[PDB]
């Protein structure tokens, strides 16, 4: 099983490793042993489906600060903290007209997401690790 001998379009034999031509079949079998051929051979989804949804009504407490939202949530009994994310109003269940604003939505596993519309372009930062906190003892989550 030699992977270098091939057949050309003229009924001949071709060695692709040394790139040599051979007319008869007896010259291809005698070209495997030699000084050139030996030198050429030597050189070469589950978490989303299991999410329970009863959707209770959350209670948020917005307040204009100066240098913040205080949403009271019940006990979730899990290590997963509730996460906030900024989304656009272009995607919706009914797609109503004139939607050109953004919404910061906070979501948790045993509760429904609560969204606040932001008409301004940029007045704060919606990052999770940068400006949010969640006290597990008092079940209070805040974000500024």
């Amino acid at each position: 099983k030699d992977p270098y001998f091939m057949k050309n379009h003229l009924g001949s034999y071709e060695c692709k490793l040394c790139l040599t031509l051979h007319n008869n079949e007896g010259s291809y079998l005698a070209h495997t042993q030699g000084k050139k051929h030996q030198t050429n051979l030597a050189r070469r989804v589950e978490v989303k489906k299991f999410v329970k949804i009863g959707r209770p009504g959350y209670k948020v407490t917005k307040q204009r600060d100066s240098e913040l939202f205080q949403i009271d949530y019940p006990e979730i009994a899990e290590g997963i903290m509730p996460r906030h994310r900024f989304m656009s109003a272009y995607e919706q269940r009914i797609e109503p007209p004139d939607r050109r604003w953004q919404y910061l939505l906070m979501a948790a596993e045993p509760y429904e997401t609560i969204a606040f519309k932001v008409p301004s372009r940029e007045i704060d930062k919606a990052e999770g690790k940068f400006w949010t906190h969640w006290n597990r003892e008092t079940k209070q989550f805040f974000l500024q």
Binding site: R55, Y58, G79, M81, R83, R85, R93, A107, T113, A115
Partner: peptide, 17 residues
Amino acid sequence: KERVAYAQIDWHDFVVV
């Protein structure tokens, strides 16, 4: 685990109160 939970939550159920 928080990144897996954040990437699997529904972001289309918006509720404005």
